[PDB]
Amino acid sequence: TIQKVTVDCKQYVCNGFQKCEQLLREYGQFCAKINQALHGANLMQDESVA
Amino acid sequence: YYSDDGNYYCVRPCVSVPLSVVYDKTTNSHATIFGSVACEHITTMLHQFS
């Protein structure tokens, strides 16, 4: 196994500031993709362990 | 920070506690995990279902 890690992409990139949060959206739907990829990796790890 | 009152304080950052959602799609039921947080901190920092 490896350590399972997930990232709060919005909090990581913009640190809560709303002015930053507004400008995050001109880059596709990037944060959702990051979350989905990490979720799939962790799910595959759990199935491997089982 | 070395204060005027005569005390030294360690200054940390703020504005985010970890949160997860357990979701069951068939029964449309869900639950929320506050990962790594004791229920005392949770019950303190809200105002009756904040």
UniProtKB/TrEMBL annotation, chain A:
Disulfide bonds join 9-31, 14-20. This is Spike protein S2. It comes from Middle East respiratory syndrome-related coronavirus. The chain holds residues 794 to 843 of 1349 of the full protein.
From TrEMBL, chain B:
It comes from the Viruses. The cytoplasmic Cys-rich domain is palmitoylated. Spike glycoprotein is digested within host endosomes. Specific enzymatic cleavages in vivo yield mature proteins. The precursor is processed into S1 and S2 by host cell furin or another cellular protease to yield the mature S1 and S2 proteins. Additionally, a second cleavage leads to the release of a fusion peptide after viral attachment to host cell receptor. It is found in: Virion membrane; Host endoplasmic reticulum-Golgi intermediate compartment membrane; Host cell membrane. Fusion peptide 1 (FP1) and fusion peptide 2 (FP2) function cooperatively and have a membrane-ordering effect on lipid headgroups and shallow hydrophobic regions of target bilayers. They are considered as two domains of an extended, bipartite FP. The membrane-ordering activity is calcium-dependent and also dependent on correct folding, which is maintained by an internal disulfide bond in FP2. Belongs to the betacoronaviruses spike protein family. Spike protein S1: attaches the virion to the cell membrane by interacting with host receptor, initiating the infection. Homotrimer; each monomer consists of a S1 and a S2 subunit. The resulting peplomers protrude from the virus surface as spikes. This is Spike glycoprotein. It comes from Middle East respiratory syndrome-related coronavirus (MERS-CoV). The lineage of its organism: Viruses, Riboviria, Orthornavirae, Pisuviricota, Pisoniviricetes. The gene is S. The chain holds residues 645 to 694 of 1349 of the full protein.
